[PDB]
Amino acid sequence: NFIPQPQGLLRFLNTSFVSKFYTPQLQLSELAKKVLTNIKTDDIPVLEREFNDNTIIHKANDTLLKVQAPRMYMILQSIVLEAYAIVNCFVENPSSLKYLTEEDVSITRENLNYVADYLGNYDDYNSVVLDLRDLDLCFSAIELQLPLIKKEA
Amino acid sequence: PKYDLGKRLFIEDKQRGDTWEFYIESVEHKFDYKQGYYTTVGVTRGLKDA
Amino acid sequence: PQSDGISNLHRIALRFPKEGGGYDMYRFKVNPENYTIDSPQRTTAIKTKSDIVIEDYGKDIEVINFTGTTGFRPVREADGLKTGKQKMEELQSRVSEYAMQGGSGNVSGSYLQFFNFTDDSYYKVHLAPQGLKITRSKDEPLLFRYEITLVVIGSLTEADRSAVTTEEFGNVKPNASQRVDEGIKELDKNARKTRDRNNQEISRRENTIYNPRQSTNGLKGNIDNMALIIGYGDGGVS
Amino acid sequence: PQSDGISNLHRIALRFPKEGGGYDMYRFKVNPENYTIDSPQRTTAIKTKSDIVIEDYGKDIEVINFTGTTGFRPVREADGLKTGKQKMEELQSRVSEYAMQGGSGNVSGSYLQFFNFTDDSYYKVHLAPQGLKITRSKDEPLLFRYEITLVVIGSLTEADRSAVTTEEFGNVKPNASQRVDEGIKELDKNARKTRDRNNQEISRRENTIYNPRQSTNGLKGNIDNMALIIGYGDGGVS
Amino acid sequence: DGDNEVKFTGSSAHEVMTGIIRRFIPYMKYNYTENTIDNYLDYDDLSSWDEFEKLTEVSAFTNFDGSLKQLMDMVTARPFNELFFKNSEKTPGKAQLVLRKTPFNPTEWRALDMIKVPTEDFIEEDVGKSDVETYSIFTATPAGMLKELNGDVFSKPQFHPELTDRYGYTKFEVENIYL
Amino acid sequence: KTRKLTNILSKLIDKTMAGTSKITDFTPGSASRSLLEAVSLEIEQFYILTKENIDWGIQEGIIEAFDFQKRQSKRAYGDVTIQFYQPLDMRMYIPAGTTFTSTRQEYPQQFETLVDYYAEPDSTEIVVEVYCKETGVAGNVPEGTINTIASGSSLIRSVNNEYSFNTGTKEESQEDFKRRFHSFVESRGRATNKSVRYGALQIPDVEG
Amino acid sequence: MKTRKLTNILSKLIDKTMAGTSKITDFTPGSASRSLLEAVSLEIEQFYILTKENIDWGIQEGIIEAFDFQ
Amino acid sequence: ANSGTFVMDDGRKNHVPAYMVAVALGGLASGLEIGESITFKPLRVSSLD
Amino acid sequence: MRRIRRPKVRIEIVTYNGDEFGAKLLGFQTKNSMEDDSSVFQINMAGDTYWDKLVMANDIIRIFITPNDDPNDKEGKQERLIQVGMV
Amino acid sequence: RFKKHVVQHEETMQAIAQRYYGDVSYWIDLVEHNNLKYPYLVETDEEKMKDPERLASTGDTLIIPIESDLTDVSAKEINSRDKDVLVELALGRDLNITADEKYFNEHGTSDNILAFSTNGNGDLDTVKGIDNMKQQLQARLLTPRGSLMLHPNYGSDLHNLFGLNIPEQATLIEMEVLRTLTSDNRVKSANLIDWKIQGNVYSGQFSVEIKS
Amino acid sequence: RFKKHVVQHEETMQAIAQRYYGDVSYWIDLVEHNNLKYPYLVETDEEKMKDPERLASTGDTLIIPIESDLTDVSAKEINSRDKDVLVELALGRDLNITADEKYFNEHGTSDNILAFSTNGNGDLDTVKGIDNMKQQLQARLLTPRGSLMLHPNYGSDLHNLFGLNIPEQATLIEMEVLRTLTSDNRVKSANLIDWKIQGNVYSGQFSVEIKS
């Protein structure tokens, strides 16, 4: 029981400058690890249409960040995996929400701020930052609310 | 609010020390500040000496 | 205070909404001859075949009714020299203006504000259905008499019910709902159709005040905001 | 007591319920001008062709109504020096505390104790539907008159309905039935289904204060436990 | 298949009714901020005469463009089973759909919870006997396709010899879809 | 697993009735029903004590045998020395709840005493423990930060904590503990692809 | 933490009870004091047994939780 | 006679000598209306030594 | 002794706040009957607010009735729900 | 429940049933309750000496059920053999804690006042019948309204009613005592018959109507 | 919301639950709300030394829920955090703008009065609980009703009221004060204690029932 995934997102998800305020650590969550293996091994169902022209559709692949800054492109993938992992459990199969913890989302936001600050230098690609800032405050609400949800459930 | 549809109703008559048994099939509530608060209890298949 | 040998008598005054905002503040120059106050209760009594049942629902709308005569001899005023007939006519015109303007169900502004300068008590009041009855019989030809009946809305100490400022901690106007709705408006008809399909599929698989901190009611708003920045299916979920 | 042969009569007193535990009382400095007690009967008489039928259904509500004023002189009190005006204001505030937050919020006391030392009678009373009525008049410039009607809940000597203890000889909880429910919680689906089938089979072929001493009411309750633990069939019977 | 025909099969009412309700309930979507009717309606703890009822092939479209209530009545097979909507005392705050065998059985009658009320709460009463309902012969015919002139045993009624003297040959027939 | 009030009280009344015919009254205010109720309530307390202790054993006991200890939130505490202007002449009294505040503008921390302490007339320098009014690492403070006492007794000259408070441990859920334990248990596997790969990571220069 | 059978508890209880006086030593089945002390010892016995069972269940649950072998 | 303990409003669980219970008592006795007694009145003391 | 009763109705609504909706209650009816194949209820509301623009159809309304006094510790202190349905 | 009666000079068993229950017909079931052999009532005691337990004679008590319990077979069986043990069973048996009767009447509305005692030999003392009621009333009256660990709103505010001995306080005390006593459903009514004052001492007495 | 309690001598844990909820059985929930170990209360204060946070003694403070939040696990969780600081959740935290009460009290109703300030070092002064409530009544009442640039009908009419010093006008000032103060849900009600008309100085003092 899994909704099929878009072809774009499925291809995207399957694989010097430094900011003074926030820095990354390239750490993955346990929950994000388990999902990555599931997609790597099992053949999840996938859709055929691509009507939804949002998110990584012509924004994350259109930008030159993929070729110019591949390390920065590795941060964006981690955030998507961490963003897709938390959305996975709550919508369906909540049994995997046991492995998530506070520090899992804490590091994700710090990684978000660093890539977001770097993208601010580029004047063309501000469209990607537009969604990231909205997503940035979304993780913080989970960060300040995830310890209460598990005890309630 | 104790009375509900499908519930068995026991009545004790103090007029002459009699006992009655009933089966509830319908209830109609009526609440209004103008005059008290009433609750109808429709019954069927009733018998005595419960 | 009443005349008690310790303080001089003081007499009733009524505050009215001014039609430009603010107020008028009328006052009587001879106090009422009769003064009556009723306090009815909503208690009801029903008699069952074997017992009596006493039931109460609380305080009912109070009634204030009083009757008096306007003085004869001229008396100086805080901005004029007004006679009893002018005072009575002013009263009739205030009352007429307050009654006539209430043709939209109820005035959005003030009820009448009543100060009992005689025995310490204050009320907010409205014209009763008896209204301002004015008469002048053969006896006492040069003295007017007025009869006023009112209904009490509440104590003047307490502000309006709906106007009370609630706690409103956290955020009553969450941005998550707003930007979700904007996203879904921006989606293509096929996108929303697929979102409807995914929602129906999830519903099939069911079986077989807001604060970002220390609150779970807004959990769905954070999750509903996702599945659009990330392509969780061709369209959001829930 | 009255003024006759015995020492000086004691005035009428009213006892109200304190929010914070305990009780507060109110004694009238001036005995009421009028005191009426109505004690009707709920009975109807209807004559037939050649006989008279009388039916009765108990005692009716005993309605107490009295009218009094407050003196203009001051008088010593338990705390402070309160004149008639203050006395009547305190009475109004007490009635309003008992009435206004009666149907709304919550009031600690369930009833009011009405003491008639002069008449040597006591009752438990509640505000009537007519309710308190205050009025001040021309020929009483300094005084204040009150009119109150009451309905008698019952005699003050008897105890409260909720504070009554029954006989309750022997055990009040039939522990076998209550732990049969507990033993049943653990049973498997097949055991319950066989229990239901056995119950149906017994049922369709029938016609053809717990104390084991000096009583047989708790007979089948002990059998169920014993049949459950020992095992008459896969589930049990009855 | 290809056509919109849907067939529901079960050996008891609780098996059929589960399939009937579960077929359409989730997709009945509404704009509730929090879910749908399946969260607010338990529709569980259903039972019926499983032993006496065989396997059923109740069709979806038994009633031409009728409501689910019309199709719910056929599954119920009244008066042998009692269907109604009432509050869930075991789980306050939500409603429950009840489908149980009729309580006129002796042991099932005792299974109903008792409620006491003295005369002290009685405002008015209007209760009495009546001879509006009166029948002598009672029978439960099987589903109306089977007919006496083209097959097996059609029916098997029951009567009391003393009862029929006052009311002679007064029949009471009920079709049961199940048998 | 666990019984409850009426469950026990009802057993007890039934056995009382069955054993003897001399008692038949079980009204409120009976000495027997009172005794029975106190017994039942005591037994329920023991049952809940057992339940809580088993819960704690499930949470921590089974894994603690491997020398791994769980971090438990506690009040910061340590030793504080008080100096007097002159040597005491009479036994001085310092109640529990004697309260402490830091005059430094960067440290709004506060402490208090849990138990009563006394200074003997012959003594001249007393060490008293204090406990922070807040849990976690907020209580932590460097040496010499209090500098003040709330009780205002003019005999006291100066006050200061000789050692920094570091016992205000943070609150860590058992999820991280369980994760780390499972990681330790999986790292002991031998003759496996993933374990061999993991073992190649110990060298700092071995990355890909 | 060990079992103690009803009669062991009851005996210890009466043995302690008789200290300091000798106006109680009559414990026929008809006596009410015997019935009360039998009921107390029954409840203590049941407490011990349920404690031991709950300990076993706790051990099992910890074994579940530690290695996640549901 | 007695020496009590009082929850002093600093949060200060003060163990307090007998001449101070006399204050707590004298204070209550002084405040009441004339002719009442301390007889069977309660006091807000925490515990007693 | 005669019993005393102090009814206190509550109303909760899920899609305007429910507590403000319950405040303007005046009276209601709840016809429930096994004889017919339909259970229906009616609610009377005060005219203080324009409810026509607020209460959209098909909303769910829950009603709770307080039988007797809270502090008395009567068995009636249960806040038993009386009826729930779809407008 | 039941009513007491005694055998009068040459009264026949028919006469009793007719006078109390109306119909004479009921005497037949009424003899089984009093477990009587055929000579159900007999005038002479030297004739009762024939087999004393199975007869009644002039001056002996009799038991008279209420009409609802007349037809109950269990009431018949119990009334047959228990005889005088009726009253005791009907008003209850429990442990006696009025060990120090002289003492508890020196410190009422204070705790720690009652205590088990010993009567007979080797068994805790027990009280029965009317004295069961004297015990429970005396204890209940001397217990404050919310001090038993379960089923509170039991007891009295007698510890709270100490006041200036003016008569309103005395009527208040009277009403509290009457409420106290009338709480137990087994007692019909109470009423005061005297209240009396001796400076700082109250004194008074109450009559209680206990069911037969 | 909640109530405070103070532990008394040898106080029985079950007595708390009974004393505020009528039934005894909710003490399991109360001790979970207060994060107690099995020794729920203890006589000796030296025993608290061992586990201060999880062990309470005589004179310590406990938190009593209201009945509706008794079984809510989330309330149990939050009530396990805000121990004897729970007031802060109802009254709130806000920024301090009363930099000197010696300043604005001598200038009164005007533009250009209050300002943000800094307590301690670096951290901007946040004023909390009862001290937030002081500010949120004071800053409200000094504002004229029309003033604020969103949600009008803030403030008070107080600036209008400087009329003639005669008694009616003084009661009008009382009324606007009462009206302004009862306008925020954090206060139940208000009433006047006293007032004093000097030759040109109004003085009066008012009670307000802050919640908790």
From residue J122, give the alpha-carbon distance in Å to each of F16, G16, G18: 18, 15, 10
In this complex, do D122 and J78 lie within 8 Å of one another by their Cβ atoms? no
Task: Of D152, D160, D146, D88, give the one whose Cα is nearest residue D121.
Answer: D152
From residue D148, give the alpha-carbon distance in Å to each of A45, C63, D88, I34: 81, 15, 13, 48
**I32 at the B interface (CB within 8 A)?**
yes
Maximum distance among all Cα pairs of chain K, rounded to whole angstroms: 68
Query: Which ranges in chain D belong to alpha helices (H)?
Result: 84-99, 175-185, 189-203, 219-230
* Phi, psi (degrees; rounded to nearest 5) at E103: -80, 5
Shortest CA gap C192–chain B (Å) = 44
Out of I14, I37, I81, name the one closest to residue E32 (CB): I14
K41-42/K56-57 β-pairing: parallel
**I80 at the C interface (CB within 8 A)?**
no
Question: Interhelix angle for K130-141 vs K167-181, to 10°?
Answer: 130
In this complex, do K6 and H46 lie within 8 Å of one another by their Cβ atoms? yes
In this complex, do C206 and E22 lie within 8 Å of one another by their Cβ atoms? no
Alpha carbon distance F139, A83 (integer Å): 36
Cis bond upstream, residue E79 (ω within 30): yes
**C155 at the D interface (CB within 8 A)?**
no
Contacts of I2 in chain D (CB under 8 A): 61, 153-154
From residue J16, give the alpha-carbon distance in Å to each of C88, D42, J33: 88, 37, 13
Residue with structure tokens 């026949």? J12
Q: Is F139 exposed, middle or buried (0-12, 13-18, 19+ CB in 10 A)?
A: buried
**D129 at the J interface (CB within 8 A)?**
no
Alpha carbon distance E142, E154 (integer Å): 8
Question: Interhelix angle for D219-230 vs D175-185, to 10°?
Answer: 30
Provide the token pair at A21: 């305020």
Task: Of F138, F38, F149, F68, give the one whose Cα is nearest residue F101.
Answer: F149
In this complex, do I4 and D106 lie within 8 Å of one another by their Cβ atoms? no
Out of A1, A134, A142, name the one closest to residue C179 (CB): A134
From residue D146, give the alpha-carbon distance in Å to each of C50, D34, D69, K15: 35, 11, 6, 45
Which residue of I3, I34, I35, I38 is the best one to mutate when testing the B interface, meaning the one whose CB has the most B CBs within 10 A? I34
3-state SS record for chain K = CEEEEECCCCCCHHHHHHHHHCCCCCHHHHHHHCCCCCCCEECCCCHHHCCCCCCEECCCEEEEECHHHCCCHHHHHHHHHCCCCCHHHHHCEEECCCCCHHHHCCCCCCCCCCCCCCCCCCCCCEEECHHHHHHHHHHHHCCECCCCCCCCCCCECHHHHCCCCCHHHHHHHHHHHHHHHCCECCEEEEEEEEEEECCCCEEEEEEEEECC
Task: Of I26, C55, B39, give the one whose Cα is nearest residue D103.
Answer: C55
Cα dihedral sign, K68-K74-K75-K76: positive
In this complex, which chains have at least 3 CB pairs below 8 Å with chain F? A, D, G, H, J, K
In this complex, do D171 and F11 lie within 8 Å of one another by their Cβ atoms? no
In this complex, do F173 and A101 lie within 8 Å of one another by their Cβ atoms? yes
Q: Is I49 exposed, middle or buried (0-12, 13-18, 19+ CB in 10 A)?
A: middle
Residue F59 near residue F68 (C-beta atoms within 8 A): no
**K149 at the F interface (CB within 8 A)?**
no
The DSSP line for F14-81 is HHHHHH-SS-----TT-HHHHHHHHHHHHHHHHHHHHHHHHHHIIIIIHHHTTT---------EEEEE
From residue A80, give the alpha-carbon distance in Å to each of A76, A126, A139, F6, K156: 6, 18, 12, 55, 52
Residue in C with minimal Cα distance to A4:
C233
Task: Of F153, F146, F144, give the one whose Cα is nearest residue F110.
Answer: F146
Alpha carbon distance F192, J205 (integer Å): 95
Contacts of A87 in chain C (CB under 8 A): 223, 226-227, 230, 232
In this complex, do A98 and F175 lie within 8 Å of one another by their Cβ atoms? yes
**C60 at the D interface (CB within 8 A)?**
yes
**K77 at the A interface (CB within 8 A)?**
yes
In this complex, which chains have at least 3 CB pairs below 8 Å with chain J? D, F, G, H, K
In this complex, do J122 and G32 lie within 8 Å of one another by their Cβ atoms? no
Question: How many residues can be counted in chain J?
Answer: 212
Residue in C with minimal Cα distance to B13:
C50
**I26 at the B interface (CB within 8 A)?**
yes
Alpha carbon distance A143, A109 (integer Å): 9
**D163 at the J interface (CB within 8 A)?**
yes
**H14 at the K interface (CB within 8 A)?**
no
In the 8-state DSSP scheme, what is residue A75? H
Contacts of C183 in chain A (CB under 8 A): 54
Alpha carbon distance F114, F132 (integer Å): 10
Residue with structure tokens 């309690």? K5
Q: Residue K169: how many CB atoms within 10 A of its CB?
A: 16
Residue D10 near residue D16 (C-beta atoms within 8 A): no
Which residue of F90, F91, F115, F116 is the best one to mutate when testing the H interface, meaning the one whose CB has the most H CBs within 10 A? F116
Alpha carbon distance D100, H29 (integer Å): 36
In this complex, do F30 and J89 lie within 8 Å of one another by their Cβ atoms? no
**G50 at the F interface (CB within 8 A)?**
yes
Contacts of F59 in chain G (CB under 8 A): 65
Provide the token pair at K42: 């203890």
Residue C38 near residue D131 (C-beta atoms within 8 A): yes
In this complex, do H15 and F150 lie within 8 Å of one another by their Cβ atoms? no
Task: Of G38, G43, G30, G47, give the one whose Cα is nearest residue G13.
Answer: G38
Query: Which ranges in D73-127 belong to alpha helices (H)?
Result: 84-99
From residue F160, give the alpha-carbon distance in Å to each of F133, F137, F142, F152, F157: 17, 19, 11, 15, 11
Alpha carbon distance H48, H38 (integer Å): 18
Contacts of I65 in chain B (CB under 8 A): 1, 31
Alpha carbon distance F94, F151 (integer Å): 8
Residue J11 near residue J41 (C-beta atoms within 8 A): yes
* Phi, psi (degrees; rounded to nearest 5) at F177: -55, -50
Out of E32, E73, E85, name the one closest to residue I39 (CB): E85
The radius of gyration of chain K from alpha carbons, rounded to an integer in Å, stands at 23
Cα dihedral sign, G14-G16-G17-G19: positive
